[PDB]
């Protein structure tokens, strides 16, 4: 049993998880580390995942007005600007308005 | 569901040649795109994983390239041996799709069949069965023909012919002929003839047998 | 190393049931999870869908839920997959597989069992009936003499062919079968040796029709 935080995955054993930015390939084994491969074009994770698949970055839709303020890494998600005219709906940022 | 459109859907290459079989996703599929190459008579092989990542034990030759929606797999130098059907496999989504598979078809020089003839079998004439086998041993192109005779008579619609996968040696082919009779039908007559004629063969070649010889 | 060993090869008739086993070896069974896919005669690839190997909770892609479903027996390392109420579409070869090294989706199939054809048909199995194609001694192309064996009249596919029990391996043609009239199959395998052997060396073709557990040793021979 037992399993130490940010490492904790346990399944026969103790295994590490893996860096944000990074997502799961492989388990563990008695004498192998984890898997983890860096998160792919589009394709984020901001946690220590035990995660099989990254998720998509944020988009920020122009039908809807939107701006990108930061373009997303693989360690964090796209930051959602709204235009350079109108002001922003709610504390970042789903719909926008004049 | 996702489509793995791989073009071409064939494609002839020399040796040494570089390769590059396509893939492309109607969805963007990010990084998860795997690459497995299936031999005749063997189960698929994964040779690549997540677009790019090289596997354990598969030659130097082959390595993948792609993001999103295009993928490329790459075969360096290729060899005689990497005669087969290439695969392309998803991850991003339930569920998961396979792609077409490009046939890959080693290029290599003209070959003259080696042409053998077989009489029906001691038992197997005993059954009431006649079978005349014509044997056409390693050649290329794939593209021959055969044409049985029976006392001269030009036989057909009474054999079939089966061919081999390209060899994973010396990239050729292997063709076989079956002319069946009664066993009455073999019994009344006596001169068994199959006549090859291969782009290798420079005059048509004819391999017989006399029954009861 | 990691091994995948499936099931032989089984006949049906529709709207009937079959079983197929996978005895997975070299790994801790429950910490990867067993997937299953089907390989279209000629055709591509679909993938079944897959089992939990620990929790034993399938997730089947759509076409294929309903009438296959993923059994386990974790005990004896064997995942297992029935399909009932068999139509004629299901004629084709199945294949277990594993990989990455967890109990997850991991869409990346690193280890492949040998495949385990099902035939979907009305027609009964038929064993092979193996003769002779004798090699000539006086004939030679190559300066190489050609001898077989004739794997005539046999139902359904398919045909195990070696030469003197695996041993001779090279210049081996196993043709692919061919499906005639009497709606049996029936292909020839054929080696090219040297012409000096004729005499000296003793040939064996060994057959192996395992549906209707047939198991023959043809001895070649000239003249």
């Not at chain 2, 053998?116 to 038992?123: A, L, V």
């Not at chain 3, 839920?65 to 059994?71: D, L, Q, V, Y």
Request: hydrophobic share 30%.
């Amino acid at each position: 049993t037992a399993c130490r935080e940010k490492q904790y995955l346990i399944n026969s054993q103790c295994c590490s998880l893996c860096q944000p930015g990074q997502k799961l390939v492989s388990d563990c084994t008695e004498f192998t580390e984890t898997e983890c491969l860096p998160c792919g074009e589009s394709e984020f994770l901001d946690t220590w995942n035990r995660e099989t698949h990254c998720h998509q970055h944020k988009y920020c839709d122009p039908n809807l007005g939107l701006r990108v303020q930061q373009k997303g890494t693989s360690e964090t998600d796209t930051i959602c600007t709204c235009e350079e005219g109108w002001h922003c709906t709610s504390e970042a940022c789903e719909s926008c308005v004049l | 569901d996702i489509v793995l459109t791989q073009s071409p859907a064939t494609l002839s290459v020399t040796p040494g040649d570089r390769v590059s079989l396509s893939c492309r996703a109607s969805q963007s599929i990010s990084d998860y795109l795997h690459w497995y190459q299936q031999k005749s008579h063997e189960s698929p092989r994964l040779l690549i994983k997540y677009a790019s990542h090289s596997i354990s034990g598969i030659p130097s030759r082959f390595s993948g390239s792609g993001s999103g929606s295009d993928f490329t797999l790459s075969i360096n130098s290729v060899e005689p041996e990497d005669v087969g059907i290439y695969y392309c496999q998803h991850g991003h989504s339930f569920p998961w799709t396979f792609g077409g598979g490009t046939k890959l078809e080693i290029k290599r020089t003209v070959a003259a069949p080696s042409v053998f003839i077989f009489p029906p079998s001691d038992e197997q004439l005993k059954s009431g069965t006649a079978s005349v086998v014509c044997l056409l041993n390693n050649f290329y192109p794939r593209e021959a023909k055969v044409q049985w005779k029976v006392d001269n008579a030009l036989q057909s619609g009474n054999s079939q012919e089966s061919v081999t996968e390209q060899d994973s040696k010396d990239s050729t082919y292997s063709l076989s002929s079956t002319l069946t009779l009664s066993k009455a039908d073999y019994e009344k007559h006596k001169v068994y003839a199959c006549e090859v004629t291969h782009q290798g063969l420079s005059s048509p070649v004819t391999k017989s047998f006399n029954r009861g010889e | 190393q990691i091994q995948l060993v499936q099931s032989g090869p089984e006949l049906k008739k529709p709207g009937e049931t079959v079983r197929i086993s996978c005895k997975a070896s070299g790994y801790a069974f429950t910490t990867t999870g067993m997937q299953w896919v089907q390989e279209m005669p000629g055709k591509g690839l679909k993938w079944i869908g897959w089992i939990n190997t620990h929790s034993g909770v399938p997730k089947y892609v759509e076409d294929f839920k309903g009438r296959f479903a993923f059994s386990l027996e974790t005990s004896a390392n064997t995942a297992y997959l029935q399909i009932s109420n068999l139509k004629n579409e299901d004629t084709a070869t199945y294949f277990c597989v594993r990989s990455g090294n967890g109990n997850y989706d991991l869409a990346y199939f690193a280890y492949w069992g040998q495949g385990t054809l099902v035939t979907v048909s009305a027609a009964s199995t038929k064993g092979p009936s193996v003769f002779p194609l004798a090699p000539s001694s006086k004939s030679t192309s190559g300066g190489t003499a050609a001898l077989g064996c004739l794997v005539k009249d046999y139902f359904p596919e398919p045909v195990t062919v070696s030469w003197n029990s695996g041993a001779l391996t090279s210049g081996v043609h196993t043709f692919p079968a061919v499906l005639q009239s009497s709606g049996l199959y029936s292909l020839s395998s054929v080696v090219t040796v040297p012409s000096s052997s004729l005499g000296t060396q003793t040939y064996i073709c060994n057959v192996n029709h395992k549906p209707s557990n047939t198991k023959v040793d043809k001895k070649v021979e000239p003249k």
